[PDB]
Every structure is written in C-alpha cells, then in structure tokens.
Design a binder for this molecule. Sequence first.
Ligand SMILES: [Mg+2]
Ligand SMILES: [Mg+2]
Ligand SMILES: [Mg+2]
Ligand SMILES: [Mg+2]
Ligand SMILES: [Mg+2]
Ligand SMILES: [Mg+2]
Ligand SMILES: [Mg+2]
Ligand SMILES: [Mg+2]
Lengths: 54, 117, 84, 136, 178
Amino acid sequence: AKGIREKIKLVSSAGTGHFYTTTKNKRTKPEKLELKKFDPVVRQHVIYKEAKIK
Amino acid sequence: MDKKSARIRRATRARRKLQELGATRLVVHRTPRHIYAQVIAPNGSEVLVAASTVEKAIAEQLKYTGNKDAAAAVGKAVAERALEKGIKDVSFDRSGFQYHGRVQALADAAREAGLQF
Amino acid sequence: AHKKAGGSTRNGRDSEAKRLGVKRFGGESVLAGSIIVRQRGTKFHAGANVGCGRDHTLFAKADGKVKFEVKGPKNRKFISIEAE
Amino acid sequence: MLQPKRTKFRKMHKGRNRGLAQGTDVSFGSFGLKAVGRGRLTARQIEAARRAMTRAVKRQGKIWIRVFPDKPITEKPLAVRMGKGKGNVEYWVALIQPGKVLYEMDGVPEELAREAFKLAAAKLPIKTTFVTKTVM
Amino acid sequence: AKLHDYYKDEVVKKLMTEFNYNSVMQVPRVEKITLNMGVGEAIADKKLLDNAAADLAAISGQKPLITKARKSVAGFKIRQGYPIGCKVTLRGERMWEFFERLITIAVPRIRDFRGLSAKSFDGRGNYSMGVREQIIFPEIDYDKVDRVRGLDITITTTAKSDEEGRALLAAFDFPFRK
RNA sequence: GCCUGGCGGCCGUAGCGCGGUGGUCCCACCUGACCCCAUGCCGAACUCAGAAGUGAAACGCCGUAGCGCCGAUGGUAGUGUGGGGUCUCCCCAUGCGAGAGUAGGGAACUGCCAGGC
RNA sequence: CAACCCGAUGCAAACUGCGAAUACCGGAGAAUGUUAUCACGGGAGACACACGGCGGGUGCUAACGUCCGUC
RNA sequence: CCUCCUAAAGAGUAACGGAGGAGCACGAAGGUUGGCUAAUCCUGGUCGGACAUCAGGAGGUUAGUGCAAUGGCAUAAGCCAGCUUGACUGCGAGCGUGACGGCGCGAGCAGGUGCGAAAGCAGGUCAUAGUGAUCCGGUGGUUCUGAAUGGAAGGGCCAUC
Ligand SMILES: [Mg+2]
Ligand SMILES: [Mg+2]
Ligand SMILES: [Mg+2]
Ligand SMILES: [Mg+2]
Ligand SMILES: [Mg+2]
Ligand SMILES: [Mg+2]
Ligand SMILES: [Mg+2]
Ligand SMILES: [Mg+2]
C-alpha cells in the first residue's frame, strides 16, 4: 500500500483559486505530469494542473 | 445488415420506448430505390403513421428523379408537413443503421419547418 | 499476518439480496425489487425477464426505481392504475 | 458395474450427511436383484457381492450390477471432536430399494446370486423381468 | 478488366450448358482470393519480417494487414497479441488483375512445376493455393530477397460444391496440369 | 381478398431440417465508383450515382411430424392440519398434488400504416 | 487400451432445461376477540435454558451429546 | 471484510461445519459516440507433421469479463478506435439495511462540463471485498472568533494528511 513504489496520493490543485481535489496515482508508471479539469469554488472548470505538470 | 445479424447496436435506441416512451420516432428506410419514413407513437399506438414516397402527391408516381440530398429530402417532406401536428410534440428519427447522406438528407429535410428538437 | 488455515469456517456476512417490495404495492418511490444491490434506472417497474418472464407490477406511485439487472432491466411504461 | 468403490475419479468436496426416500428402477439385462429395505452398501460390499458371483462357473455370462456410489463418509480416531472429520476411506452408497444385478445368460441365477446376497447389507428379493412391457 | 471479360465473354456459357442451369446468375462467380504469409517469429517478429509485408504489399498493390494472434499460453511462447501475419485480400477489379497475372505470369515458376494441385478444393468449391517461395511476381530490384516467408492465397468462389467447381476454374486457367 | 415493405403484440402448437416456389410492384442480389463517406487489408461491410441481368443466394411463401417444442386423464412422489405405528422410515383421516412418462397437439396467430391486381 | 459423440441406467449441500405443499408480502370482505395494534414516556428483569415433535448441520441418522430453525 | 452451501423456494439465523478469495488494480481498465462479436472442431494452405496467421463450413451462454465465488452480461458489462475528464461542485423526493456509530440505493433540482446531428448518456470502474471510529495534532482556505482596544497567538468552520 504505502510502499514508496506503488500507488500514492495526488494532492492535485488548480490554477489560481486555491482549490484541492484529490485522487490516487502511481510512481513507476509514467508520472511527473498531470492535469484535468474539475469544478472549482464556482464558475467554470479549466486548468487544475495539480502537482506534476506537463 | 440484418441477414448476418440483428444482435447489433441497431436496436439499442429503437428501445426508446422505455423512459422516453411518448417519444415518437421516424424510422426511415434505405432500400436503394425508395426511402420510406412513417411516424407512429412509440409502441403504445402503432395506430399512427406518416408517409413514404407516396407516389401520388403532385403527379401520380411522385414525379421525382434522383436520390441524393435532392430526392432524399422530399422523401421526408411529406411526412413532415403532413404531420404538422406532431412536430412540437418532439418526435425523433431513428438512424436505423447509419446517419449519413441519404438518411441525413431525409432527417434534416424535416428539421426545416418541423420536428422541434 | 497469518490467519491462513482453511478450516473452511468462513461467513460472508451477506446482505441486501432480498426480494423486498413484493407484488404491486400501493406505490411510493420506495425501492422494492432489489436483488443484486447495484441497481440503476427502473422507474415504475413492470417485471421483465425473457422466454417466460415479464412480471406485471401494475401498481406503484410514479417511479419505483430499483431492480438492477438480474431481474427485468428498467421497466415502466404507461402503467399506473388507470393510466400514465 | 464394478465398485472398487472406485472413487468418483477424485475429490470435489466430501461432506453432506444422509437421508433416504424411495427407489427408482426396473431392469437392463435378464436376472435382477431387487433391493427393498432401506440401507447403504459399504461399497466394499459390491466387491464382495461380485467376488462371490462367480465360483463354480467361469466368468461366463455378462454380469452387470448397476448402482453407483458417490458418498464420502469420514470418521474419528480416539479423539474429542473438533467437528472436522478426517479422511473418508469408507464410501457407503445410498441404496433405498432400487435393485441392480444382471446375469446376461440363460440359467438358474436365483440360487446363484442369492449365493452372494448374504454378503449384501440387508434382505433383497430377486424378480426378473426378462423383458419390458412393464414400462413404455 | 483483363480476364473478367473472358468470363461472360467465353466462360459463363460452358457452365450454362455443362452442368446445365438456366440463370446467368447461378453461373459460378469468383468472390475473392486473400493471400497472407504465415509462420512468424515467436520472439523475433520485429525488424526481422516486417519487411515481410513490404513484399506482399506491392505484390498485390495494397496495404497488408499484418494480422495479429488469437492463441493463449500453451506451448509456443506467444501470448495472443503479436502480428505474425499479412492477409491482404482482393475482391475488386484488382482481383482479376492478380489473376491475369498468375495463370499467365509464373504459375509455372519452379523446376518442379507440372500444373495445379488437382485435389485441393475446400470441400464446397474454393481452392487454396500455396507454393513456398521466390517472388514469382517480380517488381523488385532483386538483390535484396530475404526468402520472405512465402505465400498462401485462397481464391474464394460462390462454387456450390467440390466437383461442381473445377470446371469453373478449369476455364481460363491455362495452368492446372494433365 | 392475394401478395410485398417498414413498425409492433405476442417470444419454440411461432424454431431447426428437408423439398417445391415467387420477380424488375416491391424487394433484393445486382451495374458502377473521381468523390460525400468507408477499409488497423479490401466499395466485403458501411457509402454514393444507378444501365443491364437474375431470383442463383438471401428473403417471403407453401408442403412435409426427421429433430426441437406444447401436452392432458389417470397413477405415482411430495406436503399443510389431525392422528398412529415404528429405528434412522413409514401408515392412515383429510386438503393441495407434481417432475418424468403416456394419448394427442403441432409446420404460429395477430394489429397500424404504405405500395402492386 | 481409453476421454470425446449416439442409444439404454443411476447419483449430487456447494447440478437444474421442471417444480409443489407452504411460509411470507400487499388488496378487498363478513364475523369474532373487555384496540389485542402502533407511537412516545416511568419502572423493570433478562441475556447459563432443558425436553418432546418436525427440518438439518455435526458425531457413529451414538449419547439425558453438540450447534441452528420452528412449534 | 468479500463469495457459495448449510439456511426448511420472503429476510435472517449456529458450530474449532464443507470450499475459496480481499487489505488491490486502472491519465485509463472512466465518460460518450460509432462500430464488432465467442470457444472449439472439419475440409483445404509454403515454410505444418498436436495446436501458428489464411479460406470457407459446422460456428448454438460449452467464449471473454483486471483478481475468489455467486449472480449477470449480445441493446452486450465482452472487443476496437476517435474525442475527452461527469473519478464534477452544491442539494435531494423517497427508499433499503442496521441496537447504535453508521452503511447503501436514488429519480429529480442549481452551476458549470464532455461525448453525440439528435433523442440522450455520464455524480468512476458488471455488481458484490480492497478497510480504522475518537483524541492529539500537521498543511492550505476564510476578516466566524480573538479575554482593555487594534493586531497577533490560539480556537471554529471547509478541504486534506
Ligand atoms: Mg452473556
Ligand atoms: Mg447465552
Ligand atoms: Mg438453545
Ligand atoms: Mg442436551
Ligand atoms: Mg432464504
Ligand atoms: Mg423459508
Ligand atoms: Mg492446418
Ligand atoms: Mg468488476
């Protein structure tokens, strides 16, 4: 589980707004890159590059 | 087609009868020569209809030559205007197989002054 | 972490399966009909299957919602009591 | 046919208790050994029943006895009772009152098969419908 | 074009009389062919033999399929996923092409030639060709061959039955032995 | 009313098999292909423009009980209540009463609308 | 010398192309029973049960055995 | 904790009863749209001599489901590709299941999304295991509070470890 090798936790984040949204990922599998949409405090979606940006 | 099978996505939407129920369809047909159409209440009232090529209309054999967006369109026009009642009631035209060209010209031929989506 | 010993003495602590909501009740947007748990759409159930099949609820309020997929997928139509 | 209490090929479970009811059969060959009186063959019996069904006359004639086991048992040594149950090694076929033995060959069989009945677990008449209109 | 005409023009009517039906539709037609090479490298299918389709491609003039694999674990070290094929089929006009380019050009390419296998009809009509190598259908610089794992090819036809066939193929086929 | 097309009700007394059969009204196969559109290869499928040809396949009909299927009546198995033997099984009063098998049935029947006489 | 397919015969808690009794669920109806029903609140005790019948695991269809169900 | 039998055809019910699985995985293995259907054998086919890609035929859950077992699956949830981020935020009619803590199902509503011509589908995976209450704290957000007052520390609230 909490093996520093397999699945970890993805804090994730958005671009200006101070949101959160969390999920899981890996390590060996291609990483050091991420970004989806998700809905912030309010309004539109967009950005949410989270940690590990392209 | 239907020969080799029926067990294909072709029936997936035809079961619009559930939930949508009242949702009426157009069916539309291919058959190289004609196109057909007809509109009936879902399943609760097949006792409804529209019109295919309906030969008699202006002349006797529905004097029309072609089958492209030209003939295909009118192929619908009749069901459309003749079924003025049903339009706002939101029908639906069911691809049957594919939504391109012939059936497109047939479907869109209705979208103009008819079937409010 | 050895709790391995077969013995074959081991439960499941089963739940939810039950055929609750038997027959055509007075109605209500109650569950009635669940079996395998998951479930999705359903609406005024009509009891379906195949070959034999096709239960006939006939009575409900306006949206039973229940039956997953092991028992007559979806349902509802025009049936209420007088009409729908 | 044979018994060797040949295992049902292998394992696939080995439990269940017991329970008997009513017989379910007629005939196949010529002479028969109706069961009657509930019980259960020790399986090892079928071996004894057959081993005795041929002493004077050669293996001549088609002996076909038709009842098939499938019924592990299991017992316990001189121990308490952890209620598990060790191996089976017994195999007691369920026999309510069917009736099965066949001696495809013209003859007196009665005094022949009864020569092996005492080996059986309980009483069992003979009866032999050489043929068939009993049941369509 | 080339040969497809020999059909109606001097091939249909032979069958219309011999065997003797009444419909120029029931006249035995030629569906397609489908070539395809086979044996792939259990392990080596990569650079080795990817130029294997390069040949079957232009040999037909289309785009190979290279195919895949439907076999799991048991004895052959492959796990249902590798290419190891070619396929390539022709039913179009280009089908008669490869025909007018078989019977005429190189049906007779090997020193061990003598005709076509009499007894190789699929049981209901079609015939599976084979042969092992060489190009037989030159259109290469020819100073590069890597004995590219042969050719199968199996002309599919609407032939009703085994013997019902033969007489069909046996009507342009200048090569077939005797 | 005869036949054909879409769309349903019913889902095997509606299916499978085998045999015969219908034609440019339909349907089909079919003619053709630079495309709109399509092939992890192919106009095979989908797609589109439509001579000529044929009902060969498909399809729909109709015949035919080889194979499915439907199936009583009676008997049997079980079983609720009430009792009685008796070893774990069984009996009787009583009410429900199968599965299998048997006679027989059987080659579906129907509705909305559109096109040929 | 034998899997595989055809005919004839069995077996199954973890087989089912069939299928009861029946218990349970909801709907009306007459009659009967000093609301027997439900809710909220004061006081509880009570969680060692034993035997007999029926259905069963176990155990040997052993046990004034043992563990469930039900009366 | 999850699956099946026991478990007497509604739930449920035991034993140191008979068999197994979990303490995950997945930028896709999710969403949608469009499309496609097994396994196995027979006859043929070069590189075969049991099975390799091809051709037709018999081709009928006997296939495949990410991992147990049960149930389910062709409208496929099984398989492939394009486009994407609904693995959304705020609520929720009414239900199921629990002594309780709690757990599960959920149409519909509001804001903004993706896929589709469109009806429409999407609030993570075919469903059922993959889990840890409280306290003490850590990190970010907010003028909720802040002991004379203005701040601040600290406390709350929301998100999360
Ligand atoms: Mg206690
Ligand atoms: Mg106690
Ligand atoms: Mg007790
Ligand atoms: Mg006691
Ligand atoms: Mg139960
Ligand atoms: Mg019960
Ligand atoms: Mg071979
Ligand atoms: Mg799953």
